[PDB]
Design a protein around this nucleic acid. Structure first.
Lengths: 50, 50, 94
RNA sequence: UAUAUAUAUAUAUAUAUAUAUAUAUAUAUAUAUAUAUAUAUAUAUAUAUAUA
RNA sequence: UAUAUAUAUAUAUAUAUAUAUAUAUAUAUAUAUAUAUAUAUAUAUAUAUAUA
């Protein structure tokens, strides 16, 4: 676009942006907690390895 | 408020009479927003339990 | 040599009505004249071809009416002309 | 006819200046919206004074 | 109870100031394109001078 010098009421055609790619997750709906929890006791922590 | 709403509608109202068109355009934007290619990423081998 | 400006020529945006002057009298004839003059043609060389022609103009509505502002504003204007008060104060209200 | 010099015109290149258009940034002005402050007007409440 | 005046608070309207957002105009800077002018170089044409 350093030059777009079309004569009179015209324009210089450009190619549409076709190649667009994504590497995340193919989704558009999200899961969320609308209301926070009450912060209960855990009663179990996690895995142990040795 | 995509169309037929700018100028008169309140900031907190929607016009029921224009609902279909507004929904229609909203879905269209939703459709266009996802037009992209599902690229492949790298991979790792899992060794975690099951 | 291979100048893109001479190869990628396409109509610009808002091409069909861009030159239309803002008026209410005879928008289509006026727009047609503006196009003719804009294109570099002079009336003395176009001859009889310049007299009856008409072209689309922004001052003309799609319905075929003379408009002076964007149609949304016209919709907004009529809408705003009718807005009864939501909460009123009268002595007998329970 | 040939050579050399000078002038003028035309073409091409480079530099400089000016104008116009487009893009980007900054500033100012005007309009519209929202927030905050001050002033003025109107209404309501409370206090005080005066009149009935 | 009512009226008037003064003070304070609250609401609404108008004006002014400041901040933020959006639009339009103008100015300045930078980049790109086009036009015009001037200078320099090269080529071609014409005129003039000198030599053969």
């Amino acid at each position: 676009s350093k030059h777009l010098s079309a004569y009179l009421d015209s324009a210089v055609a450009n190619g549409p942006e076709l190649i667009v790619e994504d590497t995340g997750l193919c989704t558009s709906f999200m899961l969320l907690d609308n209301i926070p929890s009450a912060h209960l006791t855990k009663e179990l922590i996690g895995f142990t390895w040795f | 408020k995509t169309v037929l709403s700018r100028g008169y509608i309140d900031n907190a109202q929607f016009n029921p009479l224009a609902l279909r068109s507004n929904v229609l355009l909203m879905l269209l934007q939703f459709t266009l927003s996802n037009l992209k290619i599902n690229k492949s990423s790298t991979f790792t081998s899992d060794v975690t339990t099951i | 040599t291979a100048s893109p400006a001479d190869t990628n020529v396409v109509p610009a945006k808002d091409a069909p009505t861009t030159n239309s002057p803002p008026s209410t009298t005879s928008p289509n004839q006026a727009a047609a004249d503006a196009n003719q003059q804009q294109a570099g043609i002079v009336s003395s060389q176009s001859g009889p071809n310049a007299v009856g022609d008409s072209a689309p103009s922004t001052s003309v509505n799609n319905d075929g009416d003379i408009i002076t502002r964007p149609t949304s504003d016209s919709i907004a204007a009529v809408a705003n002309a009718t807005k009864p008060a939501a909460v009123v104060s009268d002595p007998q209200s329970m």
